[PDB]
């Protein structure tokens, strides 16, 4: 047998789905979402890290002049100066008072630290869904894992489960993302080869190991301090290290629906959006012919007390009489109320208790068991607490709601005098019809 259902995309909220098959006892299964993982694409746009500035020993000269020869290196720069008269510990370096010259040059390269610490920019666009389910089958909890895209089919305990596809294509991610060691950020990185100094992307590297790099750091030299031998540099401050200082809030806090985000691999998990379709092919072995199930008769219901709450605040006692000892499923056919229990053993002329959750001020509903219906009417009361920690979406109430006793009040209010006014209009128009024929 094949059964298809749909459930809200929520985690930790048990769901009852009643599959019925003529000629056999109908059975209701409990399905729970352990977690749902969304794996986005991974197109590594590039990486970046802190840079090291290499400035070899400056070239000094006397009574002669140096010269700049271009170097095919990133952001390589050079300069010359004249008239410098450096002094060392033992005295002047050389005699030429002003005929001397100084040549300096520098460049910037990647740091070995990049091999361990860095920030990587990807252009992830799409994603795939995988999920974990817990199912109450034959009186035991069973775990299943499958891709929640409507394609993956999984066989367990002789039954075939298919999940997905996700109703909503929404994702918390973005086309372009930047990832640190364990943090993710939605942020539009500058295009490769156009890094703006002092900002993210100031140095661009294709890979942590690729020797080729790109840089933009305005490396300008300056005239050295008089009387000293040294190289000054106007090295641009590293925007990469700085961006780590102003990273801002991570996406695990800014993600709508709070989809928890992990790494290695990067996934977004546990966000409630849309719903999921599930198709279950269940072999008939689990199915039991109706004759096998014990009968039921003399059904009475009572509610000693009930309390509409996020928990199972409602308790109902039912008196039942059955043919023989045996298991029997229990369900509520009204979505406004949910029942924690799935089935129960029935011996005969006995009673039982059931714990349920509702949201109506007055709970008036039918309950199905052993292919029989029993009414239940009660007046719940508001609990004391206004907010709770654990989640509970079972007790969902639409705009339609039970006015309870006040229902009668509005039923009494609905009475109007339109009938009498129409009667008066008819009477006047007829007594006029003596003179009013067809106008």
């Amino acid at each position: 047998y094949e059964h298809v259902t749909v459930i809200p995309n929520t985690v930790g909220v048990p769901y009852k789905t009643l599959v019925n098959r003529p000629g056999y006892s109908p059975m209701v299964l409990e399905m729970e979402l352990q977690s749902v993982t969304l794996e986005p694409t991974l197109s590594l746009d590039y990486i970046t890290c802190e840079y090291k500035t290499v400035i070899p020993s400056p070239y000094v000269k006397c009574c002669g002049t140096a010269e700049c020869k271009d170097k095919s290196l990133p952001d390589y720069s050079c300069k010359v100066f004249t008239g410098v008269y450096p002094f060392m510990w033992g005295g002047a370096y050389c005699f030429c008072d002003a005929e001397n010259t100084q040549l300096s040059e520098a460049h910037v390269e990647k740091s070995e630290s990049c091999k361990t610490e860095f920030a990587s920019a990807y252009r992830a666009h799409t994603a795939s869904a995988s999920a974990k389910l817990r199912v109450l089958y034959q009186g035991n909890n069973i775990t299943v894992a499958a891709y929640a895209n409507g394609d993956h089919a999984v066989t367990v305990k002789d039954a075939k489960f298919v999940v997905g596809p996700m109703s909503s294509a929404w994702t918390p991610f973005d086309n372009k993302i930047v990832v640190y060691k364990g943090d993710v950020y939605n942020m539009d990185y500058p295009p490769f080869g156009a890094g703006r100094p002092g900002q993210f992307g100031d140095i661009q590297s294709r890979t942590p190991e690729s020797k080729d790099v790109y840089a933009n750091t305005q490396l300008v030299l300056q005239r050295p301090a008089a009387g000293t031998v040294h190289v000054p540099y106007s090295q641009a401050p590293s925007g990469f290290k700085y961006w780590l200082k102003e990273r801002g809030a991570s996406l695990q806090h800014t993600a709508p629906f709070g989809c928890q985000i992990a790494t290695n691999p990067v996934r977004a998990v546990n966000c409630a959006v849309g719903n999921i379709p599930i198709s279950i092919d269940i072999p008939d072995a689990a199915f039991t012919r109706v004759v096998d199930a014990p009968s039921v008769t003399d059904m009475s219901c009572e509610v000693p007390a009930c309390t509409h709450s996020s928990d199972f605040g409602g308790v109902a006692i039912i008196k039942y009489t059955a043919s023989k000892k045996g298991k029997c499923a229990v369900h509520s056919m009204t979505n406004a109320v949910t029942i924690r229990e799935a089935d129960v053993e029935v011996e005969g002329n006995s009673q039982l208790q059931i714990s349920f959750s509702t949201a109506l001020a007055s709970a008036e509903f039918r309950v199905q068991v052993c292919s029989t219906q029993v009414h239940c009417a009660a007046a719940c009361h508001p609990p004391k607490d206004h907010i709770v920690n654990y989640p509970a979406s079972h007790t969902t109430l639409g705009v339609q709601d039970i006015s309870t006793t006040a229902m009668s009040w509005v039923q009494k209010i609905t009475g109007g005098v339109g009938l009498i006014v129409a009667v008066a209009a008819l009477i006047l128009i007829v007594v006029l019809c003596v003179s009013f024929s067809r106008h």
């Binding site: 806090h253 709070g258 509409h308 709450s309 996020s310 001020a361 007055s362 007046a379 009361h381 508001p382 609990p383 004391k384 607490d385 206004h386 907010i387 709770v388 920690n389 989640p391 705009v399 709601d401 006015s403 309870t404 006793t405 006040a406 009040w409 209010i413 109007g416 005098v417 339109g418 009498i420 006014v421 129409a422 008066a424 209009a425 009477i427 006047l428 007594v431 006029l432």
Partner: protein
């Protein structure tokens, strides 16, 4: 202030705490004194209560057209009179009292 859909707070490096609303108050209650306005305010505030406002104005509208029919019946009943030359209703205005029953 919690929203109807829940709110989560992260404190330091400790695991975040989740709070989502439950029903508001016990102040509302069903009984001989209506006390339902509190029901429909505490639960679904501003909803199912402005609905009562629209119900109010529409019921005012039906009663308004009812008094309209009253005046229409008044004019319709006096019109066949329209000060007839006979000027007599011993069995209608003396009994039905439709309009200006002071006279006849």
């Amino acid at each position: 202030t919690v929203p109807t859909e829940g709110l989560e707070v992260t404190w330091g490096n400790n695991e975040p705490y989740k709070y989502w609303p439950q029903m508001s108050t016990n102040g509302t209650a069903h009984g001989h004194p209506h006390e339902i306005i509190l029901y429909y305010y505490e639960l679904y505030p501003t909803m199912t209560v402005v609905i009562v406002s629209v119900a109010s104005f529409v019921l005012l509208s039906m009663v308004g057209t009812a008094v309209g029919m009253c005046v229409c019946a008044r004019r319709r009943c006096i019109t066949p009179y329209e000060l007839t030359p006979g000027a007599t209703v011993p069995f209608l205005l003396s009994l039905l009292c439709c309009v200006r029953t002071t006279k006849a």
